[PDB]
mmCIF file of C-alpha atoms and ligand atoms in Angstrom:
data_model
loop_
_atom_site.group_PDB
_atom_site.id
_atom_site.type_symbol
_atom_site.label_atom_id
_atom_site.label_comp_id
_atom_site.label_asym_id
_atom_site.label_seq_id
_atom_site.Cartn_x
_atom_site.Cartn_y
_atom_site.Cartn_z
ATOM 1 C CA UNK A 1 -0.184 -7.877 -5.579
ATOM 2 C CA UNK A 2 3.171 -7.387 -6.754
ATOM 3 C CA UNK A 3 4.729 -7.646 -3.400
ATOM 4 C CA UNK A 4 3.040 -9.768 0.523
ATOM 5 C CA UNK A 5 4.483 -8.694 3.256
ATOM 6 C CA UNK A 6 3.674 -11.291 6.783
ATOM 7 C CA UNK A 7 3.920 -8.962 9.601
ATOM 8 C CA UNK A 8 2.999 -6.580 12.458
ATOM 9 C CA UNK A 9 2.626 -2.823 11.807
ATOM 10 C CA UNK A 10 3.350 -2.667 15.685
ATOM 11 C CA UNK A 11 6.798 -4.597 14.871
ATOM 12 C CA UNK A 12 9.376 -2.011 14.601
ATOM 13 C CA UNK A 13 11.268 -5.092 11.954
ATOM 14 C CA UNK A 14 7.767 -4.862 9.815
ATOM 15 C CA UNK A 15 7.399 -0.870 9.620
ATOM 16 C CA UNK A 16 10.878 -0.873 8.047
ATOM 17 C CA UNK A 17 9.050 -2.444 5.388
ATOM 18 C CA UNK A 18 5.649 -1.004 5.306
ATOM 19 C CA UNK A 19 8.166 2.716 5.433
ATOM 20 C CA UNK A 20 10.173 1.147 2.159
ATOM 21 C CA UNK A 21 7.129 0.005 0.394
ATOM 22 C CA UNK A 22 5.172 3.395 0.591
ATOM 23 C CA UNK A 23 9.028 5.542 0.086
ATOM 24 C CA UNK A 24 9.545 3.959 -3.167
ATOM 25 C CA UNK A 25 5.560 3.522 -4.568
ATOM 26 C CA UNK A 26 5.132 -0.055 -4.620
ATOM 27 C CA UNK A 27 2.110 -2.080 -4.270
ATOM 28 C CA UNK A 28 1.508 -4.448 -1.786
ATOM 29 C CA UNK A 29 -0.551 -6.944 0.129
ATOM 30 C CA UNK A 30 -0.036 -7.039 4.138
ATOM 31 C CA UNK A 31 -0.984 -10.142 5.484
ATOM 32 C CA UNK A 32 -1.068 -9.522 9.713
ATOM 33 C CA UNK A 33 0.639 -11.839 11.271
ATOM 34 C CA UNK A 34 0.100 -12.461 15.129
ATOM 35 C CA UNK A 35 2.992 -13.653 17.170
ATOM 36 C CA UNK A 36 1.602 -14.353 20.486
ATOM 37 C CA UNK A 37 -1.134 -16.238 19.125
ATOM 38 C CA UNK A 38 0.950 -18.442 17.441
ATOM 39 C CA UNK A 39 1.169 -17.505 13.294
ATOM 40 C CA UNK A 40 4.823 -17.992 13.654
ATOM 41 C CA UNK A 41 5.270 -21.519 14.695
ATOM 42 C CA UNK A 42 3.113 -22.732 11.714
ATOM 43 C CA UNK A 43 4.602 -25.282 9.106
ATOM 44 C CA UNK A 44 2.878 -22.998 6.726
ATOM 45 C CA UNK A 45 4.669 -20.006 8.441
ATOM 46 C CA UNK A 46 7.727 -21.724 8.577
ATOM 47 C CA UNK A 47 7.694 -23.172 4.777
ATOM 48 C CA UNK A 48 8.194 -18.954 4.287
ATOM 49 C CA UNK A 49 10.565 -18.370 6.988
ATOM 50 C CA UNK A 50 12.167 -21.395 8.554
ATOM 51 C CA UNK A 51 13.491 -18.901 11.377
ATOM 52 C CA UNK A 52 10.405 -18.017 12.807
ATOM 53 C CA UNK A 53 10.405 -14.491 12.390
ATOM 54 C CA UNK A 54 8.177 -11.596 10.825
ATOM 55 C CA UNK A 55 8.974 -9.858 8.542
ATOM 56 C CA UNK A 56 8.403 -12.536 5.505
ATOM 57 C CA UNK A 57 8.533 -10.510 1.892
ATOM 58 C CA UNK A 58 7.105 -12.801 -0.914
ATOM 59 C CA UNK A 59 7.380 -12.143 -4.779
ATOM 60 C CA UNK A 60 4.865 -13.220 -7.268
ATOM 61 C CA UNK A 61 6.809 -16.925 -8.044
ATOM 62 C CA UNK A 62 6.398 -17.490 -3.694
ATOM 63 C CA UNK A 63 9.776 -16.893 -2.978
ATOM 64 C CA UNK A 64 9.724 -15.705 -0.107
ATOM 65 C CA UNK A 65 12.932 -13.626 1.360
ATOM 66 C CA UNK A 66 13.107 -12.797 5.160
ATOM 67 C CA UNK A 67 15.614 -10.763 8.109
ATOM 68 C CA UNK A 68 14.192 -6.787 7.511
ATOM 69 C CA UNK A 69 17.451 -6.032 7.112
ATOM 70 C CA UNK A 70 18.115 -7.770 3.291
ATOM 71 C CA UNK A 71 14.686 -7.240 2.533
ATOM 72 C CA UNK A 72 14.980 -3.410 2.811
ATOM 73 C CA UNK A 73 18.527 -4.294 0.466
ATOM 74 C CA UNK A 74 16.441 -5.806 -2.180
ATOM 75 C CA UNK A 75 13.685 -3.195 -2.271
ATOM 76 C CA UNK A 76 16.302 -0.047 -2.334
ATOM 77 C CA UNK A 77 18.823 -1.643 -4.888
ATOM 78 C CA UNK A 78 19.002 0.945 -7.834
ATOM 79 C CA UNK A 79 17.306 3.615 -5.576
ATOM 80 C CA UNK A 80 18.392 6.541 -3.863
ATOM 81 C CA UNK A 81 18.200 4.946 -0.873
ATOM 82 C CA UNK A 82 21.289 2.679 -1.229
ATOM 83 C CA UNK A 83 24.437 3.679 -3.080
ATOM 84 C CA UNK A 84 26.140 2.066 -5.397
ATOM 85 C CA UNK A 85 29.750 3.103 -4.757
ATOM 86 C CA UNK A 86 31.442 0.439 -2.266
ATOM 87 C CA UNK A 87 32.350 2.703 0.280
ATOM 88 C CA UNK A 88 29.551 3.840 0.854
ATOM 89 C CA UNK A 89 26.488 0.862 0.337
ATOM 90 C CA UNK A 90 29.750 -0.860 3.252
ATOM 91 C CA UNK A 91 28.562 2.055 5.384
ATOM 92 C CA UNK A 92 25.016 1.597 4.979
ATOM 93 C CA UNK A 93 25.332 -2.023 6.106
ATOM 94 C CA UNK A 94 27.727 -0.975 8.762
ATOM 95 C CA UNK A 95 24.816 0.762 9.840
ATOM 96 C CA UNK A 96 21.915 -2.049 9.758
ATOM 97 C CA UNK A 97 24.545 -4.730 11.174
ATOM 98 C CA UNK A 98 25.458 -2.619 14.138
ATOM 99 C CA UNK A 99 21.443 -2.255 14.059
ATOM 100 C CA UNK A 100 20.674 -5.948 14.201
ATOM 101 C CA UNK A 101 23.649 -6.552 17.015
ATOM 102 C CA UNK A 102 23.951 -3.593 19.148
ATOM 103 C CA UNK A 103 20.561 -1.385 19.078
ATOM 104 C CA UNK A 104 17.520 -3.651 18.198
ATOM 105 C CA UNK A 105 18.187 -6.382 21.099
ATOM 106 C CA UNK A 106 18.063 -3.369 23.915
ATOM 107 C CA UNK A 107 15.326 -0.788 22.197
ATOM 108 C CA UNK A 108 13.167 -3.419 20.775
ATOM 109 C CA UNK A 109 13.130 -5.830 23.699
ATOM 110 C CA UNK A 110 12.974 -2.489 26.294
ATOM 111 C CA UNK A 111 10.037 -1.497 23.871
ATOM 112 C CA UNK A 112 8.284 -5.162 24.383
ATOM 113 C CA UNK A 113 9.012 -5.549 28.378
ATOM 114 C CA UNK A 114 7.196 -1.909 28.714
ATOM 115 C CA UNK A 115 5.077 -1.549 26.524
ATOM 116 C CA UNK A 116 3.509 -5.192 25.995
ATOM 117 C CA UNK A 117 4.144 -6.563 29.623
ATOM 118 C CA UNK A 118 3.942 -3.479 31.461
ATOM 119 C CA UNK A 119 7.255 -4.261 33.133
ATOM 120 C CA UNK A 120 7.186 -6.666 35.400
ATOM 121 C CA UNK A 121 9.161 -6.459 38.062
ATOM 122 C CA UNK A 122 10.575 -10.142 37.106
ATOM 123 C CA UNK A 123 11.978 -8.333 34.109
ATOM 124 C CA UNK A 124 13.489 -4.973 35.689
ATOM 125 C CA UNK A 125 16.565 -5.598 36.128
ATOM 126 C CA UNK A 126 16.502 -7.308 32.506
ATOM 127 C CA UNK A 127 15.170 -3.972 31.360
ATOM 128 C CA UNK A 128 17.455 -1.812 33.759
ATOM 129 C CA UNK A 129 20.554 -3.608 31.517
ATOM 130 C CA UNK A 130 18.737 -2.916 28.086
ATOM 131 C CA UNK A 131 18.482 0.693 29.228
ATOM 132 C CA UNK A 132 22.609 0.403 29.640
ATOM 133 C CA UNK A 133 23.396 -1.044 26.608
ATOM 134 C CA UNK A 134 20.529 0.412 24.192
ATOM 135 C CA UNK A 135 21.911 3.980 25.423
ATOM 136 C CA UNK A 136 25.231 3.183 24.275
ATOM 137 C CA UNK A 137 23.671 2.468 20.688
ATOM 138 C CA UNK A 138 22.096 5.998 21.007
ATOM 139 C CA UNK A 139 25.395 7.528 22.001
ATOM 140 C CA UNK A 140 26.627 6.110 18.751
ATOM 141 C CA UNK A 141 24.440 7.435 16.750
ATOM 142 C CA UNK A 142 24.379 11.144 18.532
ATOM 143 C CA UNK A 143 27.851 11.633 17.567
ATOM 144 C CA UNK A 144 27.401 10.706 13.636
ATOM 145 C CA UNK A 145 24.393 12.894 13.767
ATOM 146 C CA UNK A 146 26.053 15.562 14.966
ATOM 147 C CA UNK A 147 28.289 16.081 12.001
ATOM 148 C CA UNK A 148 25.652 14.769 9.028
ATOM 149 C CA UNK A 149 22.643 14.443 8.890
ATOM 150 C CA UNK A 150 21.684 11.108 7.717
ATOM 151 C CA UNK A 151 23.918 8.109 9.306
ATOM 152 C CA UNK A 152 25.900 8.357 5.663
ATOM 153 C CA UNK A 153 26.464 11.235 4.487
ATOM 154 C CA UNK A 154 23.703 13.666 3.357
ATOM 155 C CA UNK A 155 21.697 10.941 1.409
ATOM 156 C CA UNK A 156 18.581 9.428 3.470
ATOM 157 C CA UNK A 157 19.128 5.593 2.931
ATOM 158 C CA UNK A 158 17.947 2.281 4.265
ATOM 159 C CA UNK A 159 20.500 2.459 6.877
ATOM 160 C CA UNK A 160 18.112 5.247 8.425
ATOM 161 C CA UNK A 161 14.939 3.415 7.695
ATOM 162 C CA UNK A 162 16.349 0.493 10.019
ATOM 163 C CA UNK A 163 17.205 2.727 12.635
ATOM 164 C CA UNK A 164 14.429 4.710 12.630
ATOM 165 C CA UNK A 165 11.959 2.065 13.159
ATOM 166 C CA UNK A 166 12.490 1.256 16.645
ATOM 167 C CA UNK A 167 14.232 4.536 17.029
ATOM 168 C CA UNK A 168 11.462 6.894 17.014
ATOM 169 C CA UNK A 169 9.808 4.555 19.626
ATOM 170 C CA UNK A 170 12.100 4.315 21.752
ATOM 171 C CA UNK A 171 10.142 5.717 24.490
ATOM 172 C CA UNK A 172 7.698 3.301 24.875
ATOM 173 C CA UNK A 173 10.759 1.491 26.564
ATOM 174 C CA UNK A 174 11.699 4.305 28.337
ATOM 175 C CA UNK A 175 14.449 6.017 26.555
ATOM 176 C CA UNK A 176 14.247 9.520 26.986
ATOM 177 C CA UNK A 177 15.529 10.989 23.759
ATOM 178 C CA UNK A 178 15.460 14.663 24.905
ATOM 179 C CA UNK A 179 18.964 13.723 25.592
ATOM 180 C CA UNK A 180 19.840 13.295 22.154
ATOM 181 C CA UNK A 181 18.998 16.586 20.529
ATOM 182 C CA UNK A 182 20.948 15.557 17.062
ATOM 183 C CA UNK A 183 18.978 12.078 17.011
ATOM 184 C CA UNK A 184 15.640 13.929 17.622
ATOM 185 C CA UNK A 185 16.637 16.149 14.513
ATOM 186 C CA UNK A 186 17.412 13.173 12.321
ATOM 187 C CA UNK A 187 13.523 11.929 13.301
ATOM 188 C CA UNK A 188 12.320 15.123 12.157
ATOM 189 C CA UNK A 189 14.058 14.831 8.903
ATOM 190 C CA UNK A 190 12.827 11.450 7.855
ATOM 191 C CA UNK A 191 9.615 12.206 8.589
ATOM 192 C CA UNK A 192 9.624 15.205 6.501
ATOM 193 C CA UNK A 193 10.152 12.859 3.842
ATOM 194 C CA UNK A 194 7.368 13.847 1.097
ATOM 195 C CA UNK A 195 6.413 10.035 1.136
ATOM 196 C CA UNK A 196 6.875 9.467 4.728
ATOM 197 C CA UNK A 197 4.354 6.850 6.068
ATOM 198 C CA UNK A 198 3.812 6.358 10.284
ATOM 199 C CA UNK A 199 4.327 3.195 11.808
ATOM 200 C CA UNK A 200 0.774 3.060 12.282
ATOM 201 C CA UNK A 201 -2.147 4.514 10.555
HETATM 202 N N1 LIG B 301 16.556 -10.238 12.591
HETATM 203 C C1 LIG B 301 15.080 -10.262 12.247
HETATM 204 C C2 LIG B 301 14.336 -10.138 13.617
HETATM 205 C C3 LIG B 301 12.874 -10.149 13.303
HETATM 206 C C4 LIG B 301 12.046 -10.387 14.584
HETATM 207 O O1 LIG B 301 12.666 -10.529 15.820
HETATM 208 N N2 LIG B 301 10.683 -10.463 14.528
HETATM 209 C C5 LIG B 301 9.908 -10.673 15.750
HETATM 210 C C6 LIG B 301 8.815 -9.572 15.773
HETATM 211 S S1 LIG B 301 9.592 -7.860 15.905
HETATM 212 C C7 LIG B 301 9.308 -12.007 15.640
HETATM 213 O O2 LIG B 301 8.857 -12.386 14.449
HETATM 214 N N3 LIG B 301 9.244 -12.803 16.696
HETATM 215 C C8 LIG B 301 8.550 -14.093 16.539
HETATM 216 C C9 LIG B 301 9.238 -15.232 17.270
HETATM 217 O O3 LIG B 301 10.446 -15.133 17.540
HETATM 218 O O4 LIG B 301 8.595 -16.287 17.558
HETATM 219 C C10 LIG B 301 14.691 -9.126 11.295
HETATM 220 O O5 LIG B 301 15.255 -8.007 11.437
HETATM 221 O O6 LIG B 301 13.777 -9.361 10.453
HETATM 222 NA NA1 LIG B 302 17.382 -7.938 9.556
#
């Protein structure tokens, strides 16, 4: 009521909002959205989101605001899960940038050619560079881990919410996180959250 939400709960972009919505206690509406079928290339889809794209978060007045990323911002502003001091709410975007740029593209699109095509072999070597690059990512984030315990600091925020999405399913496109002990210890950590919700039900 309060809040809509257009999307996926198999989206890794959506369950970053369907995990913010149930952290923080707030009502909602989902309204499933299906991609392949076409829901996205509406002119009633795109009136919400001219990009194209689930998620789509719209208020009570129809505004509608869209990229997971900002909508997570709006939901967690005032919260615990994003600071207020500069230093570090610039970290926790640090974070969901270098998530939109450098981890998303390789574990979300691994996730798809796996998972959802059953990788062709038109797509291996495709999905043979994802693995490259989408490790990297995981390097990156093995190293912070192994010194705190939430990407900033000791304060669970939205930048873990956006990692964690696709993160935690990153073997359905093959990852194999038992080489990243200190990320498999940050999974176990969100999810111990008392309000932790699964991607899928
Ligand atoms: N940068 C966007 C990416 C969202 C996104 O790629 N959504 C996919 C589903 S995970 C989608 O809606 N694809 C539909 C299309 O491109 O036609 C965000 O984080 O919200
Ligand atoms: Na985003």
């Amino acid at each position: 009521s309060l809040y809509k939400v257009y999307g996926d709960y198999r989206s890794g972009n959506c369950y970053k909002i369907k995990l913010m919505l149930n952290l923080l206690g707030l009502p909602y509406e989902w309204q499933a959205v299906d991609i392949l079928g076409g829901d996205t290339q509406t002119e009633a889809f795109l009136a919400k989101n001219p990009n194209g794209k689930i998620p789509v978060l719209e208020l009570e007045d129809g505004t509608c605001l869209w990229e997971s990323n900002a909508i997570l911002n709006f939901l967690a502003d005032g919260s615990q899960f994003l600071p207020s001091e500069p230093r570090l709410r610039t970290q926790v975007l640090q974070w969901q940038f270098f998530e939109q740029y450098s981890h998303e593209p390789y574990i979300a699109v691994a996730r798809f050619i796996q998972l959802y095509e059953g990788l062709p072999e038109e797509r291996r070597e495709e999905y043979l560079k994802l693995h490259k690059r989408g490790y990297k990512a995981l390097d990156v984030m093995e190293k912070q881990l192994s010194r705190t315990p939430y990407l900033v600091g000791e304060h669970y925020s939205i930048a873990d919410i956006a990692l964690y999405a696709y993160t935690h399913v990153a073997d359905e496109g093959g990852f194999d996180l038992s080489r990243y002990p200190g990320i498999q210890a940050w999974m176990q950590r969100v999810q111990s959250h008392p309000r932790h919700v699964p991607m899928l039900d």
